[PDB]
Amino acid sequence: SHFATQKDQWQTYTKEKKIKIGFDATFVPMGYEEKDGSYIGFDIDLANAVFKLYGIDVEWQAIDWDMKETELKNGTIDLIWNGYSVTDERKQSADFTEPYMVNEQVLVTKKSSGIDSVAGMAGKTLGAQAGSSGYDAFNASPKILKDVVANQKVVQYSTFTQALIDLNSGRIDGLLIDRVYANYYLEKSGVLDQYNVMPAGYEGESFAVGARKVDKTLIKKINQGFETLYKNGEFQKISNKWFGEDVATDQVKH
Amino acid sequence: RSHFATQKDQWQTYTKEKKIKIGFDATFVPMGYEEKDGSYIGFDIDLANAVFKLYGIDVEWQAIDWDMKETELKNGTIDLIWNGYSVTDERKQSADFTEPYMVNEQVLVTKKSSGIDSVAGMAGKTLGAQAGSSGYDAFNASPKILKDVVANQKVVQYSTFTQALIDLNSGRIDGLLIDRVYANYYLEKSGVLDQYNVMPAGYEGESFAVGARKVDKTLIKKINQGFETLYKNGEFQKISNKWFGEDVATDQVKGKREGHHHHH
Numbered sequence: 079s080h081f082a083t084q085k086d087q088w089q090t091y092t093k094e095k096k097i098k099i100g101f102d103a104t105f106v107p108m109g110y111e112e113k114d115g116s117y118i119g120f121d122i123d124l125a126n127a128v129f130k131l132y133g134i135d136v137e138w139q140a141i142d143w144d145m146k147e148t149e150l151k152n153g154t155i156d157l158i159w160n161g162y163s164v165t166d167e168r169k170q171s172a173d174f175t176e177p178y179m180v181n182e183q184v185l186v187t188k189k190s191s192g193i194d195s196v197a198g199m200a201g202k203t204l205g206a207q208a209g210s211s212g213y214d215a216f217n218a219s220p221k222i223l224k225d226v227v228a229n230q231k232v233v234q235y236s237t238f239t240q241a242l243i244d245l246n247s248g249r250i251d252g253l254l255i256d257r258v259y260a261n262y263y264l265e266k267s268g269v270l271d272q273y274n275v276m277p278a279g280y281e282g283e284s285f286a287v288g289a290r291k292v293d294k295t296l297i298k299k300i301n302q303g304f305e306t307l308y309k310n311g312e313f314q315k316i317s318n319k320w321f322g323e324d325v326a327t328d329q330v331k332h
Numbered sequence: 333r334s335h336f337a338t339q340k341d342q343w344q345t346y347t348k349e350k351k352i353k354i355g356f357d358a359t360f361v362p363m364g365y366e367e368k369d370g371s372y373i374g375f376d377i378d379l380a381n382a383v384f385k386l387y388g389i390d391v392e393w394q395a396i397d398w399d400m401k402e403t404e405l406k407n408g409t410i411d412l413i414w415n416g417y418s419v420t421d422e423r424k425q426s427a428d429f430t431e432p433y434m435v436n437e438q439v440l441v442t443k444k445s446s447g448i449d450s451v452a453g454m455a456g457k458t459l460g461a462q463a464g465s466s467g468y469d470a471f472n473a474s475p476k477i478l479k480d481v482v483a484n485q486k487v488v489q490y491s492t493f494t495q496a497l498i499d500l501n502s503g504r505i506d507g508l509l510i511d512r513v514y515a516n517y518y519l520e521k522s523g524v525l526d527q528y529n530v531m532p533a534g535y536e537g538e539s540f541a542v543g544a545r546k547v548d549k550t551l552i553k554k555i556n557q558g559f560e561t562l563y564k565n566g567e568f569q570k571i572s573n574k575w576f577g578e579d580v581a582t583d584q585v586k587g588k589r590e591g592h593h594h595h596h
Contacts, residue, residue: 102596104589143596163595181595208539209419211595217421233536236435236583237591249476249534259591283595332360332398332416 083153088295091156096135097296099125100149101160103140107262107320108161108285111140120320121159124178125287127312128303147171150290157296158288161258172288175300176329182282183212184260185223186253187274188245193252194274200226202251205241208234212254215280222279223254238263254278257325265322284327304330338408343550346411351390352551354380355404356415358395362517362575363416363540366395375513375575379433380414380542382567383558402426405545412551413543416513427543430555431584434572437537438467439515440478441500441508442529448506449529455481457506460496463489467509470535477534478509493518509533513576520577539582559585 082090091097101109101121109119117138129136139155146162149155151171161181164174187193193202204227206212216223216232224230233250235241238259244250253260257275264270289296307313308330317325337345346352356364356376364374372393384391396404401417404410406426416436419429442448448457459482461467471479471487479485488505490496493514499505508515512530519525544551562568563585572580584592 102593105593105596106590110590161593161596207591209594236539239591256595332357332418 083151083290084292086293086295087156088293088299091134091296092132095133096137097129097157098137098139098155099157099159100139100141100146100155101158102143105160107258109138109159119160120179120316121161121285123316123319124307124313125157125159127307127316128300131303131306132299146288150288156289156293157300161285162288163283164286168288171291173291173294173297175287175289175297176304177284177286177327178304178330179285179325180282180327181256181258181285183215183254183278183280184257185274185276185278186245186255186260186264187251187276188248189272189274191251191274194276196223196276196279197226199223199252201228203228203249204232204252204254205235205244205250206232206254207238207241207256208236210256211283212256212278212280215278216254219280227252257282258321261321261323261325265320270322301329338406338545338547340547341550342411342548343554346389346551347387350388351392352384352411353392353394353409354412354414355394355396355401355410356413357398360398360415362513364393364414374415375571376414376416376540378571378574379562379568380412382562382571383555386558386561387554401543405543411544411548416540417543418538418540423543428546428549428552430542430544430552431559432539432541432582433559433585434540434580434582435537436511436513436540438470438509438533438535439512440529440531440533441510441515441519442506442531443500444527444529446506446529449531451478451531451534452481454478454507456483458483458504459487459507459509460490460499460505461487461509462493462496463491466511467533467535470533471509474535482507512537516576516578516580520575525577556584560587563587 103111107119109117109121112118126136141149141155146158150158185196193199204223206216213232213234238255241253245253260275264273287300308326313326313330314324358366362374363376364372366372377393381391394410396410401413405413440451448454459478461471493510496508500508515530519528542555559568563581568581568585569579
């Protein structure tokens with residue numbers, strides 16, 4: 079039908095036992111292409127789990143991320159799921175599910191540093207990622223850390239790995255970074271327990287799933303899928319595998 | 333040309349007219365500068381020329397009053413600011429940036445014959461720096477890096493890099509702190525880069541990127557893709573080696589986007 083995209087197609091996804099989901103193949107650790115060519119990530123596991131409950135297989139489609147809204151509206155994909163989030167501009171092209179994970183800015187310090195509180199950064203040196211949302215939040219809400227840390231400024235680094243090198247050596251006392259990165263990397267390296275990873279105090283972006291506004295049943299069925307997985311313990315397993323913690327939102331629970 | 337050209341995405345025009353104008357500071361060696369003979373040369377000039385050659389776009393190089401760069405860009409007098417330019421919140425109010433193509437930072441330079449192959453190895457050794465340089469200020473601002481360990485906890489200041497090197501070569505000083513762009517450029521130009529240890533000092537650096545009008549979203553993407561294309565076909569590496577004697581490509585230029593996503 080020429081107008082499938084203008085209708086609630088839940089009965090279609092369920093009958094065809096398949097649904098198409100677009101993602102940015104480079105977005106570690108939400109959904110990305112590994113060196114061997116496989117598609118893995120938190121959202122990959124999460125979405126596969128949700129749809130498995132309905133006997134639906136996910137057809138993962140690596141897309142031009144800038145074209146995500148267009149592809150969703152054209153029927154190229156049926157969902158945008160890859161660390162996606164609500165934006166009033168995005169709400170122009172899609173309806174969203176309840177948020178499933180909060181990606182807030184976290185302050186990371188060595189357990190041995192004794193800095194187990196954001197306020198404990200008073201007079202201490204802070205590091206952050208160049209051009210990251212953490213850098214911007216640092217300035218936007220100065221009362222949180224700027225007016226506390228040494229020199230009222232942050233040392234900028236290229237990557238979390240370079241930043242972590244200086245955190246470990248002691249060149250910097252703390253590191254402000256995306257929760258998604260802090261937990262994924264520290265857990266993958268098996269040293270998460272050697273660090274205090276604390277919510278910094280800035281409003282974090284909530285990850286949610288995007289669908290065509292007409293697919294109302296689809297959205298609610300994903301929402302329910304989250305609950306189902308959180309009650310049978312699946313959500314926690316997936317979450318632990320990727321972040322070493324339960325990231326479920328209250329809703330899921332010159 | 334449209335009165336509102338500056339108001340929109342001109343990728344169509346650049347490709348059509350097969351031209352784009354880039355502003356630079358004619359004194360900024362080695363990124364882009366005017367030589368004695370009057371020619372304009374530099375790492376950025378070679379890099380930008382190479383990127384636009386991919387698209388069949390000729391580059392019109394415009395030496396500008398550097399202080400007027402953002403104005404020139406917004407005025408439409410130039411289409412890009414490419415001459416060791418970088419991101420700052422202030423500059424972001426006037427332009428959009430490509431991904432960074434190289435990192436500049438203070439490097440500690442020592443002769444390989446000195447045996448000093450680490451910054452820590454400078455303990456008790458004499459350090460030189462150029463007078464009125466970013467390294468001088470960095471040396472003092474972060475004493476724990478080198479100031480505390482070097483002899484006398486001070487640095488011998490030099491007016492020119494040439495004098496500094498003369499003394500490094502004679503043993504007068506054991507190490508020299510200077511911008512990576514200058515260290516690699518001069519040493520490679522002299523064909524002696526392999527006789528020195530050029531090590532990142534530990535002081536916060538800066539990342540060079542290209543600035544364009546915020547409306548030129550496509551142009552920015554085409555440049556980012558250009559960097560990647562040149563690295564894939566080897567041209568970036570050739571240009572980098574010509575000017576610095578090493579590969580200065582950032583992970584972004586190399587196509588490694590892991591860890592660079594910001595609440596997208």
